[PDB]
Amino acid sequence: LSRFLGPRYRELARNWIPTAGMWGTVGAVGLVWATDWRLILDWVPYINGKFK
Amino acid sequence: REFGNLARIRHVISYSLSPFEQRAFPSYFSKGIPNVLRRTRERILRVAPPFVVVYLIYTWGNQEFEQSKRKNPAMYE
Amino acid sequence: MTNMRKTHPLFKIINHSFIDLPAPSNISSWWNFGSLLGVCLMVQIITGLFLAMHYTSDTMTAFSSVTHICRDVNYGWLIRYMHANGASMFFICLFLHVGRGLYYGSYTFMETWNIGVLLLFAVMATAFMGYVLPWGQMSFWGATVITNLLSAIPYIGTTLVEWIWGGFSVDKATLTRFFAFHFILPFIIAALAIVHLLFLHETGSNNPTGLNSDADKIPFHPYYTIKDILGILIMFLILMTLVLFFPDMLGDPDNYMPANPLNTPPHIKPEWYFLFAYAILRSIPNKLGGVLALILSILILALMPFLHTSKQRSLMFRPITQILYWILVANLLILTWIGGQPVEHPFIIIGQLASISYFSIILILMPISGIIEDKMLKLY
Amino acid sequence: MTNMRKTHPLFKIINHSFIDLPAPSNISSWWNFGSLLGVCLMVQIITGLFLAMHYTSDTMTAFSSVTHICRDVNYGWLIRYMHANGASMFFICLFLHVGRGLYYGSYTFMETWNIGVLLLFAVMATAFMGYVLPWGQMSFWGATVITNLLSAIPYIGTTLVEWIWGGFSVDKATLTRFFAFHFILPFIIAALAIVHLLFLHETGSNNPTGLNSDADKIPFHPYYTIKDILGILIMFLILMTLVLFFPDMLGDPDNYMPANPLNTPPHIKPEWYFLFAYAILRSIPNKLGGVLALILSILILALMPFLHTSKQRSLMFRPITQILYWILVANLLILTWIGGQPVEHPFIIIGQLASISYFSIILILMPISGIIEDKMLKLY
Amino acid sequence: SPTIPSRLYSLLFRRTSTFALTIAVGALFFERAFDQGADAIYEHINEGKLWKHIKHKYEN
Amino acid sequence: TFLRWASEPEHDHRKRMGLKMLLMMGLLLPLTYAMKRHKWSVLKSRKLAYRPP
Amino acid sequence: SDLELHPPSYPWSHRGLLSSLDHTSIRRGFQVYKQVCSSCHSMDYVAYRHLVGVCYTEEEAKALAEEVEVQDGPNDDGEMFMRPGKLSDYFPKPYPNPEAARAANNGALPPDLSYIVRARHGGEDYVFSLLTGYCEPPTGVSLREGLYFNPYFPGQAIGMAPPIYTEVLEYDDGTPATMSQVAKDVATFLRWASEPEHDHRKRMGLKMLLMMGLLLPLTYAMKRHKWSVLKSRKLAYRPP
Amino acid sequence: MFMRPGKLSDYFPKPYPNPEAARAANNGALPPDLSYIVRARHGGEDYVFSLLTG
Amino acid sequence: KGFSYLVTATTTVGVAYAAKNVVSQFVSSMSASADVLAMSKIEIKLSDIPEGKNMAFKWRGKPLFVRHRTKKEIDQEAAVEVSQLRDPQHDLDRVKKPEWVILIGVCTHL
Ligand SMILES: CCCCCCCCCCCCCCCCCC(=O)OC[C@H](COP(=O)(O)OCCN)OC(=O)CCCCCCCCCCCCCCCCC
Ligand code: HEC
Ligand code: HEM
Ligand code: HEM
Ligand code: HEM
Ligand code: HEM
Ligand code: FES
């Protein structure tokens, strides 16, 4: 879609990428918290204690 | 949404009769056969060549499968 | 006095949807297939309810219960073969429904099209576990094959397969949970069909000419009521001729032996729609690529509204893309035949060419043909 | 730019039904029980779906399958006791729903009340067949009791009980068809609940004062959203303490024995929510009279809106009818108790007087109280 | 004069995305902490009765 | 033949019901088609005129 | 007669709302069942794989599973052979069919003790009262041989001989094997066999009460916060 | 277990109690149950006739 | 606002914890059970089968192939090179013992 090119949409994307990154971060954290992903959860300080 | 405000039609007159006064099959064969033939002639060259090449591919595949299951006479020894 | 049909709220909804619905006056017999699908869904629901009334989902007694249905239950053979041939007729009507949409440009109703695609996945899944439900040889081995296809997914696929199997193979837990899923998903299909009809009613129906048919609108009753009644009667004629004369020409003979986990059939042939998907699977020679090939071969239906690059909605006035469309339908017929045939020469190369041609003429050739046609009619 | 919430069709239906619904601002906690019933229905659907995922409807394997769910399936004991105590909670919420409707004059919504009565029948049948499902001793014997009580009908009863039995007693076919019906009937309950809510939204909601609430109405969200969430949390508290601490006080120990046709239980009783109907049917000493008394005692709720002889809707300003209604609730408690203990002395006369007083209060005494209440308020 | 709820609002409770991040991280840490505390309460209530309390007699 | 019977004990009843279905549906299909053409005859012989000023 | 004697409420170690079972008592009760009760009763819904993890080590459970011989098959030529038991095998039947049990037990059928606590009125209290309640019949109660007077049994004429007494077995812990101790241990074991999810369910309930005592004031606070707009709303009427 | 004369409710008698006895009596080959052999083999009764006469 | 949103966040954390627990219990419920976990690992085996034969059992839901091989087959499969195969792996690394070979019957195609 060539309509979404141009400086206004580029700076709108520049405004919305911190919020998009934050939403991706909370998605990843919720995913690992729900799935109990050992590969990520073994590198925390505390959650090692439950061995999961 | 409903009838009444769908379209804008002006100066159009429609004529209809009773189903109980007109025939259900008015010249069903003497006009049905030329109409079906005309429709077939109009849309026969868009369906028949793909279906015929399907038939050709089907026969070719079955034939060469039978020939591949056939014994090659190169192994006499 | 008050018009109760237009005043009572359930009667108001039935009036606004089925009675006084403005329908195009020129829709062909291809537009009866939605009502055929709904009626066939109701037939499947009722017949399956009777089969589950006389059916036990245990690996020791599933096949014995099916034989008990066919032999001891009064007209249980009629109910079971009605259910099986009605599933086949359901897929026939579903494929003709999708073909009507593809030919007449009904995919521009994007929400309706996407709800239809979700309904399509629900119907294939439901029919798959219904096919494994009698616990035959082909049933068990088809379940094993499709779930190993699920195992082709990297890094989570094995865990998903041990999760969905209820163990480490297709066994008692798999059969029982597949019975529960096959019971419950057609009601989700009915709810999704209600959402389908709601999204259709939001924008009205389509006509073969592809034009704005609001100039000539007729009510759904009595014209399309009696037209759909005639279509229902014709579908019942075909289904009952299948049931009472050829109850096994669409099924599998090898499904009539009990499922032996040791022995295997020399040919693993699922039903013909799964043979189409199966040929698209085996055309690409790796597990992961074949799995994404199958899911993409179904999902390009949902991708279709963004590939429409023509200024005319229907194919009625588009002759080149008509030729490509019938080439595509011919190619699906060839793919079904290859899925039926075993993996021997020349079926590998024929199926590979068929899958390449299928994906190419859906993704590439049809929009290019549309551009050529709009240039040809002096519109580009 | 458009308002997507009230522009998108499914979204605008959801918004007009649940989000922007003008609700009375003063409805108390008694108005949470409809949403509690809906949440209980969803919980039952999920828990029973998993129970049927691990359940086989075979007479030889029903009890062993239930034990396998309880012991071998991970948290299958939790699922099963969630199902049973959710049935108890479902009937608690149903009884409080009906009590709200009777006290606050909600039966004047005649079609909504009748759809609710049909819902009550469907839920009672669903729970009866589900209680039959584990194939315990009390399950089998209660099934025989209820089917013979249906067989009491002259010239129709024997053929109907042989048809429902699938034979000559409660057996393989009866258990399997009861499993099929118990699976399918909650979805009919859900569809009838959509009809219930549709009729209610057509008529609007009722306030405890019984007045015209259009002067002071608030949006459903977020007020009744958070109120219903609090009610759901409290209902889950009671359900989970019933599951995790007292799982058998509302159940029956005799259901933990295998179903023995040769051995009778010491005292046969149905579940606690069938006890008032069981007590009145024991009270009238005729089989046809007893089954007709049961049927009329449940249909009298549908007969209720034609008994409103007062110019006030709710019982908030009706003290005599309040006293009569609380005596009615007390008599329902007596009937549940009398269905508890067997049919001996003095339970004969206690149950007979309880049934006669129950019918007399609900038919004769309440309209007479309303009439003299209007006379005392000088209405005519 | 800035209080602890004031700092919590100015840092984490203002934006919805970082609000949800706070909810998720708190869910993880509170799941571990609540599981540890409730398990310890259960052990202290049922000292000397559980298999994890009596396995050392019958192992090795 | 005995194995065919043991495989399909519903063979004769199925053929009899198929004959009944064939005769019955050969009776209904012209009749239902006649009903469809009768109800649809209003539109099929409808005449359209355009009379602009 | 037609009367029933209600068993009294004994103070078990698991009768509290957060109290678990005594796993040593379940061990002693399993030993009592294996050495005494297994000759007549069946426990077909409980296995050695159920035993491991709450009472025994895996090696100990394997040893006491292999000490009994079970029937298995078929082999290559199709013959029912006999092999030592494994963990996945259930407790062995003392009788192949209930009719054999009735024949070998003077007509009375010994019920399966996998749900007897959950299936009898009183439960473990009823089991303790039945086992320790054997007494001589009173005057006027003539009981034929093969039946024993038991006040806690409905009908008062049980077909069970008194199964336990003083020094009826030997415990491995050195606990005195008195009648009351044996009855309490086997009642604890039968309660475990009826509800294997007992301590796990109690832990779920403890977590649920702590969690809901956290959630309910806070959810109520959210409800009052949202409803504070209406509960403090003031109305005024100013007609002209 | 004991022996009694059969009646109409009984099915056709078992030649072998388990398929391993069939393997033992047929040197490793399993004679399939002939209740669905026509519906199970391609050709059906044609296949049975050709197998017996071939 | 921090106090009110702290109350809201604590409620949401609690509901998230409870929801994750109940969904985890349901998912683990429809996962594998104790019977299929017990019947998978332990395998009873005999040694009453001569050399050059095959035995088909059930191990982890799969057809277990226990093959007693002959010395000619052992020598041929030890002398065959691994450079011409699709995956380089010889018999001394595939199996520990030459007489007995333990394999699965699940084909790596379908
Ligand atoms: C150029 C032809 C001119 C014909 C003139 C006929 C006389 C015209 C004047 C008298 C009127 C007679 C009736 C006219 C009906 C309508 C007009 C008509 O038929 O036109 C010809 C028709 C459409 O023309 P058009 O769309 O331009 O075709 C270009 C092809 N791309 O085009 C056709 O019919 C050609 C169709 C050819 C299709 C070939 C397909 C080959 C490949 C099939 C592969 C299928 C998949 C196989 C598997 C692959 C993988 C292994
Ligand atoms: C063989 C002599 C047995 C021994 C050893 C044990 N029991 Fe038994 N039991 C036996 C019979 C023949 C019967 C039936 C008696 C009758 O009248 O029904 C029983 C019954 C029971 C019961 C059920 C009582 C009831 O009211 O249903 C229980 C709870 C019971 N027995 C307990 C029990 C225990 C705990 C045992 C081990 C110490 C035990 N019995 C041993 C036969 C025999
Ligand atoms: C159980 C499955 C389905 C049911 C019950 C169903 C139902 C219906 C019905 C009753 C109609 C109206 C009849 C008509 O317009 O011809 C309709 C139309 C339509 N369906 Fe479906 N359908 C199903 C599957 C599908 C699928 C698989 C697709 C697409 C991939 C789809 C897309 C459409 C579209 C686009 C229309 C509009 C056609 C038009 O406007 O002319 N549906 N559907
Ligand atoms: C509420 C709806 C349904 C129920 C209760 C149901 C139930 C059943 C049952 C119990 C069986 C096994 C009985 C047997 O095959 O002998 C079965 C088989 C089957 N089901 Fe369904 N079904 C339903 C809907 C559907 C639908 C909508 C489809 C397909 C679109 C479908 C496809 C199949 C197929 C193909 C079989 C195999 C029949 C055979 O092999 O004999 N079912 N169904
Ligand atoms: C599965 C069964 C049922 C469901 C899901 C259901 C659902 C609901 C819901 C969501 C409401 C609105 C919330 C409320 O007012 O509490 C409601 C209200 C109502 N229900 Fe039900 N209900 C069921 C059964 C019944 C029964 C058994 C009756 C009466 C015999 C009934 C009669 C009514 C009436 C009259 C109202 C209107 C109350 C008012 O306007 O204040 N419903 N129902
Ligand atoms: C789609 C919905 C449902 C399904 C699939 C379902 C399925 C089942 C199954 C498989 C059982 C056997 C497990 C057992 O015996 O414990 C059962 C039992 C039972 N069901 Fe349901 N059920 C559903 C809804 C309901 C509803 C709505 C009610 C009552 C209002 C109900 C009441 C019961 C009861 C009381 C039992 C007996 C449980 C016991 O005795 O322990 N069920 N159900
Ligand atoms: S499954 Fe073995 S080669 Fe295909």
PDB file of N, CA, C and O in Angstrom, chain B residues 9-16, chain C residues 215-216, chain F residues 42-43 45-53:
ATOM      1  N   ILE B   9     -35.451   4.241  -8.612  1.00  0.00           N
ATOM      2  CA  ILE B   9     -35.927   3.837  -9.927  1.00  0.00           C
ATOM      3  C   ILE B   9     -37.012   4.808 -10.359  1.00  0.00           C
ATOM      4  O   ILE B   9     -37.977   5.034  -9.620  1.00  0.00           O
ATOM      5  N   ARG B  10     -36.854   5.382 -11.547  1.00  0.00           N
ATOM      6  CA  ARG B  10     -37.830   6.308 -12.097  1.00  0.00           C
ATOM      7  C   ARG B  10     -38.228   5.868 -13.497  1.00  0.00           C
ATOM      8  O   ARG B  10     -37.415   5.319 -14.245  1.00  0.00           O
ATOM      9  N   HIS B  11     -39.501   6.112 -13.824  1.00  0.00           N
ATOM     10  CA  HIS B  11     -40.051   5.948 -15.173  1.00  0.00           C
ATOM     11  C   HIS B  11     -39.943   4.512 -15.676  1.00  0.00           C
ATOM     12  O   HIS B  11     -39.709   4.272 -16.866  1.00  0.00           O
ATOM     13  N   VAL B  12     -40.123   3.542 -14.781  1.00  0.00           N
ATOM     14  CA  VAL B  12     -40.013   2.136 -15.160  1.00  0.00           C
ATOM     15  C   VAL B  12     -41.350   1.459 -14.904  1.00  0.00           C
ATOM     16  O   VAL B  12     -41.867   1.501 -13.783  1.00  0.00           O
ATOM     17  N   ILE B  13     -41.903   0.827 -15.936  1.00  0.00           N
ATOM     18  CA  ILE B  13     -43.203   0.178 -15.852  1.00  0.00           C
ATOM     19  C   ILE B  13     -43.009  -1.325 -15.988  1.00  0.00           C
ATOM     20  O   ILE B  13     -42.367  -1.798 -16.933  1.00  0.00           O
ATOM     21  N   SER B  14     -43.567  -2.066 -15.042  1.00  0.00           N
ATOM     22  CA  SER B  14     -43.456  -3.512 -14.960  1.00  0.00           C
ATOM     23  C   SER B  14     -44.825  -4.145 -15.168  1.00  0.00           C
ATOM     24  O   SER B  14     -45.832  -3.657 -14.643  1.00  0.00           O
ATOM     25  N   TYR B  15     -44.836  -5.243 -15.924  1.00  0.00           N
ATOM     26  CA  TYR B  15     -46.043  -5.948 -16.337  1.00  0.00           C
ATOM     27  C   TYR B  15     -45.936  -7.382 -15.847  1.00  0.00           C
ATOM     28  O   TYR B  15     -44.931  -8.049 -16.116  1.00  0.00           O
ATOM     29  N   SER B  16     -46.965  -7.867 -15.153  1.00  0.00           N
ATOM     30  CA  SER B  16     -46.974  -9.252 -14.704  1.00  0.00           C
ATOM     31  C   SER B  16     -48.393  -9.800 -14.733  1.00  0.00           C
ATOM     32  O   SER B  16     -49.362  -9.048 -14.632  1.00  0.00           O
TER      33      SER B  16
ATOM     34  N   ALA C 215     -31.735  -2.562  -7.871  1.00  0.00           N
ATOM     35  CA  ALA C 215     -32.742  -2.073  -8.805  1.00  0.00           C
ATOM     36  C   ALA C 215     -33.876  -3.072  -8.987  1.00  0.00           C
ATOM     37  O   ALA C 215     -35.030  -2.669  -9.172  1.00  0.00           O
ATOM     38  N   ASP C 216     -33.575  -4.368  -8.934  1.00  0.00           N
ATOM     39  CA  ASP C 216     -34.568  -5.425  -9.120  1.00  0.00           C
ATOM     40  C   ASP C 216     -34.430  -6.401  -7.957  1.00  0.00           C
ATOM     41  O   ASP C 216     -33.678  -7.375  -8.037  1.00  0.00           O
TER      42      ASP C 216
ATOM     43  N   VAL F  42     -44.594 -15.455 -12.528  1.00  0.00           N
ATOM     44  CA  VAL F  42     -44.837 -14.015 -12.510  1.00  0.00           C
ATOM     45  C   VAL F  42     -43.607 -13.264 -12.998  1.00  0.00           C
ATOM     46  O   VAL F  42     -43.698 -12.349 -13.824  1.00  0.00           O
ATOM     47  N   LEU F  43     -42.431 -13.662 -12.514  1.00  0.00           N
ATOM     48  CA  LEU F  43     -41.200 -12.996 -12.910  1.00  0.00           C
ATOM     49  C   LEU F  43     -40.733 -13.404 -14.301  1.00  0.00           C
ATOM     50  O   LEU F  43     -40.165 -12.576 -15.019  1.00  0.00           O
ATOM     51  N   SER F  45     -42.379 -14.116 -17.038  1.00  0.00           N
ATOM     52  CA  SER F  45     -43.096 -13.422 -18.098  1.00  0.00           C
ATOM     53  C   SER F  45     -43.251 -11.934 -17.810  1.00  0.00           C
ATOM     54  O   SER F  45     -44.056 -11.263 -18.460  1.00  0.00           O
ATOM     55  N   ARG F  46     -42.509 -11.413 -16.838  1.00  0.00           N
ATOM     56  CA  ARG F  46     -42.569  -9.994 -16.523  1.00  0.00           C
ATOM     57  C   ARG F  46     -41.997  -9.172 -17.669  1.00  0.00           C
ATOM     58  O   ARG F  46     -40.944  -9.501 -18.220  1.00  0.00           O
ATOM     59  N   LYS F  47     -42.699  -8.106 -18.036  1.00  0.00           N
ATOM     60  CA  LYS F  47     -42.278  -7.232 -19.120  1.00  0.00           C
ATOM     61  C   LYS F  47     -41.878  -5.876 -18.558  1.00  0.00           C
ATOM     62  O   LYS F  47     -42.570  -5.323 -17.700  1.00  0.00           O
ATOM     63  N   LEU F  48     -40.760  -5.347 -19.039  1.00  0.00           N
ATOM     64  CA  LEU F  48     -40.211  -4.094 -18.545  1.00  0.00           C
ATOM     65  C   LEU F  48     -40.245  -3.044 -19.642  1.00  0.00           C
ATOM     66  O   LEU F  48     -39.887  -3.320 -20.790  1.00  0.00           O
ATOM     67  N   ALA F  49     -40.677  -1.840 -19.283  1.00  0.00           N
ATOM     68  CA  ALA F  49     -40.686  -0.706 -20.190  1.00  0.00           C
ATOM     69  C   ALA F  49     -40.051   0.485 -19.496  1.00  0.00           C
ATOM     70  O   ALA F  49     -40.245   0.691 -18.296  1.00  0.00           O
ATOM     71  N   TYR F  50     -39.284   1.260 -20.251  1.00  0.00           N
ATOM     72  CA  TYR F  50     -38.646   2.470 -19.758  1.00  0.00           C
ATOM     73  C   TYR F  50     -39.226   3.649 -20.521  1.00  0.00           C
ATOM     74  O   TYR F  50     -39.100   3.713 -21.748  1.00  0.00           O
ATOM     75  N   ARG F  51     -39.860   4.576 -19.808  1.00  0.00           N
ATOM     76  CA  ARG F  51     -40.555   5.697 -20.442  1.00  0.00           C
ATOM     77  C   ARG F  51     -40.077   7.013 -19.842  1.00  0.00           C
ATOM     78  O   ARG F  51     -40.786   7.637 -19.042  1.00  0.00           O
ATOM     79  N   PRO F  52     -38.888   7.472 -20.221  1.00  0.00           N
ATOM     80  CA  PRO F  52     -38.392   8.752 -19.719  1.00  0.00           C
ATOM     81  C   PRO F  52     -39.106   9.908 -20.394  1.00  0.00           C
ATOM     82  O   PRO F  52     -39.664   9.746 -21.490  1.00  0.00           O
ATOM     83  N   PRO F  53     -39.118  11.098 -19.774  1.00  0.00           N
ATOM     84  CA  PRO F  53     -39.747  12.250 -20.420  1.00  0.00           C
ATOM     85  C   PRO F  53     -38.780  13.009 -21.321  1.00  0.00           C
ATOM     86  O   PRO F  53     -38.895  12.901 -22.541  1.00  0.00           O
TER      87      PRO F  53
END
